[PDB]
Amino acid sequence: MLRFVTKNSQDKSSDLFSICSDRGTFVAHNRVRTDFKFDNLVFNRVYGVSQKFTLVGNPTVCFNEGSSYLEGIAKKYLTLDGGLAIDNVLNELRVASHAYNITSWRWYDNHVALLMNMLRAYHLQVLTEQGQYSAGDIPMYHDGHVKIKLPVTIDDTAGPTQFAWPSDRSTDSYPDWAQFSESFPSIDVPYLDVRPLTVTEVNFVLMMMSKWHRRTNLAIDYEAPQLADKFAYRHALTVQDADEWIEGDRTDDQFRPPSSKVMLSALRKYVNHNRLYNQFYTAAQLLAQIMMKPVPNCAEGYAWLMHDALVNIPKFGSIRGRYPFLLSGDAALIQATALEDWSAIMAKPELVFTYAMQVSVALNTGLYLRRVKKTGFGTTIDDSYEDGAFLQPETFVQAALACCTGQDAPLNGMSDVYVTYPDLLEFDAVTQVPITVIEPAGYNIVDDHLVVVGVPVACSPYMIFPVAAFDTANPYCGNFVIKAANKYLRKGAVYDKLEAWKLAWALRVAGYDTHFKVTKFYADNGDTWTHIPEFVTDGDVMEVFVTAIERRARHFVELPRLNSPAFFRSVEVSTTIYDTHVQAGASRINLDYVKPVSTGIQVINAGELKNYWGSVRRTQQGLGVVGLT
């Protein structure tokens, strides 16, 4: 995850932003300078381009059965090829079978749900103490023309301002827990080791073991039942503050949730003690992938925002506190990527939020990129693009990321886990958008409802600028030249679709709107980005007519008559970012703090694609899932 953010070490550094949001949303400002080079002299415009992101979401959770993983177990009981040694654990058990039949049969170690719960609680408490925790509210689209407003399940103003405990006292049951220090396990039941945790951190862990009530519209407050019906924890001291709060003995005031630092320390201690590096890596990946979506500045863009995601979080199971000697020894085949990403998150916890911000934009753009690159602008005859990585729900987000940006998207590192949108597997997926009553201008409104085909572009690429989405030079590349039209006639300046869009974008930045035929280039002011129109994607057309290029009221850098001969000059456009700052209502990272803990940790760089330890690579032939090498 860290390498993806740093673009494989851009000058061995990158930048991060902490989580901040008001009313469930936050703007993401930018400052850029766009050049215009014609007549061998340079003009420029410095403009502020913003981008709205929202934390509001309602994903569908699926706490179904999942496989077991024993990576953070001592090297002498695990093995790369020999796997789990049941003979060694029976010998060291201290007949054998008499313990086998009791509990030694399950072997269902998996804490992904617990780690995800602790992470989302940390994020929610961060928002709480920043004075910004509240019920979500999706923004409205006021543009004089057709207006969009969406509902929320919980009202913002009545919504809670404080992150209380997820579960509600005196309404639902809790898992039955009791401290357990016996060497010999007695009941087949998850045993989780929390020995080195303080009273408050172990209290927080076992309280988050309970079930989760949703009290807000945010995407990370999803519903979650109790991870285990019964369980026991390996701790020297018997903790019952949570138990006292379960009954009326402890009041709400005296059992307030801890501060963000305490939850972060609890998570660090838990993962370090149980050697849960890969499991936490998967948990962070999933939480970031479900974190948020970008608020569109166009009308048809909200169709992407209407969709809800489906997540496969595995059912919880912990065999690490059953036997004290499991963790005695260096951990077995811990992935190097997991170690470095874990060190990066623990050093800077905002890395997960920044990666979520990058991944939302990359995925939303890459879905459009794949719906276009399948047909290749309609000059691909067969189906030899091999976009099949989009099919299996696990490599959905990874394939979208790889298609949008050339970088290797990081696989989830875990089997039967994914974040997927089932209804958007196919690119000819129609969506309906509830729409208020205002006269139209060619937004193909049907029965007072925007009909949207496929998935729309809903964000500017200004947080991943070198995206290289297209092969040719374009605004996504950043620097491009504007060439003369293919041939000039009465209708005017036959232009190829992609080059026509490039010209339209450059003129819209420069202050001239353009008129097309087979009518203008509806864009956004705040975000002077002009999203690619449907004439590029439809593939029925290959040349387009630009009739007239007019002057907007907000004039800017002056250009000649581009759409006519003897007056056109081959201007070229280059933009650079001056200042970016995610405000609402930064922290530099370099590869100096990446150095992971290698003391008593066996590290394998190689991975097997069966467990999804790899990275999907986009090539010209198409996407492709590649191992970690």
Place this chain on the structure above:
Amino acid sequence: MLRFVTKNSQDKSSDLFSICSDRGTFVAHNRVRTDFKFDNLVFNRVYGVSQKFTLVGNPTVCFNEGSSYLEGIAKKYLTLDGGLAIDNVLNELRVASHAYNITSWRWYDNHVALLMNMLRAYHLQVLTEQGQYSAGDIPMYHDGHVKIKLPVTIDDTAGPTQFAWPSDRSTDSYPDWAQFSESFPSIDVPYLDVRPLTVTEVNFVLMMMSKWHRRTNLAIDYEAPQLADKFAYRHALTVQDADEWIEGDRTDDQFRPPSSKVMLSALRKYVNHNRLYNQFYTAAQLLAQIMMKPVPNCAEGYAWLMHDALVNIPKFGSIRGRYPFLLSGDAALIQATALEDWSAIMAKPELVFTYAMQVSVALNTGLYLRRVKKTGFGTTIDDSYEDGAFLQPETFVQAALACCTGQDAPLNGMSDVYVTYPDLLEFDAVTQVPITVIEPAGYNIVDDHLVVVGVPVACSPYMIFPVAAFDTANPYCGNFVIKAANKYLRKGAVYDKLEAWKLAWALRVAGYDTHFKVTKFYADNGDTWTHIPEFVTDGDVMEVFVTAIERRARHFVELPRLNSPAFFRSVEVSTTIYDTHVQAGASRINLDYVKPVSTGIQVINAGELKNYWGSVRRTQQGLGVVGLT
């Protein structure tokens, strides 16, 4: 003096401004263009920077005893090494001793006070006929915050609008004068030869022989008693118009002071006839050095303006009209610098005023430069800077000029004459400034009084731009580059003090104010120059923190986030002057008119440092008084 103004012949030319001032002060406008070169393309801002100068002053005069000089005497009675030949004058006297005992013993030729009186009267009459002669008035400092207002000894509005005679009729006595044409002197008393002067010019000379009453706050209207108690002038015609005005015979209307042209012609005739080139050169130097001070645009800057100067003008004595044959023959060892500067002033009389304007700025800046260069920003361990030229009061102004600007400051050319500030010999000199009652912002106000240490910078260098005050590139140099910070941390962008000031100045010009720690950069609008803050001078600090660089209301050329990595670009700044004009309420000079009169004038380029015929040179080791070579 001329070479100092022309910077040793800048393209063999320079520029001058005539004296002009309203209410005792005059602005000094400028127009400059500041560049900003980053991303291989150039931005610029063209802004008007002004500077206020005031003629108001109250120097302390000291008409004490001084040495005698016989330079403009015939070559056969003076000698470079043999000196005054008393045998030759006794032979040519036409016993000898019988004339010795009478008058031939004194030999006290010195007219410096008379020449200075005629020059200041010329300047005052110029101001009078320009409709700008009035009582002085020091400007007030209105800035919303703490405000400064200073008093004046004579009220402006009640102050006279016309330059009347210095002395007051029917209040004080006058020197007793009578025409004298005898070959044989009778009484030991100064005898000054005014033979070729007209009636009005000789009248003006002998009237200025009287004592001077101050009727204005200007610095050149200083008090002066009558130069000689008794004297007689060598003139063919007995002039008594001044005598008639002494009594009631002549009214005020009929004895108005002459026009500026008449006084200038009188001075030219007097100095040419008596061969007073060196004496006039010293008089012009002194008058220019006391002319004026720059009005600061900062608060603590007025402390320099509060100070008063101490001047050593020698007591008058003239042995040149005693014997008609003294001036018969070519003059003896006249300095070449004196001749060329005399020719330049007579051709253009505004050279003295322009040199005064240059010298005020150079001296005020160089005092700060020496108070800093002694410690070398606090990385000099010993006292091996050899600033001892500042100690003796005679080479005070010269040392300040040499320290500010690399050019050789011209020595006074005369012994026991100086313009000096006794209390500012030491750089740890505290001064108090009367201050009006307004809430503070960190101007260390004590008991409603600005406490100021040392001497503050009170002027912009825009009239001497290539100043080269500092060794490194800086705004004083004009062109400099802005480098990356030494190292970046949470507080932000460790910067060396000098480079931090360079960055602050460049940003303040560009429209961004900057915040420092160990708080901003208080500067002036009208004069966008930002004076060097105390963190540069204190020498306790060597690195400074720049926290944030904000955008002012009056935005200008846009720059990226300079104080952060991945966003900083090494901008470079260069400024050039577009138009300068000294307005209130120019005259080009080239080295074509410099050609001095060499007919019957013996000229020596070499000089002896005993009589202060040299030029103090600043080197890296320190200052140093160097002869004329």
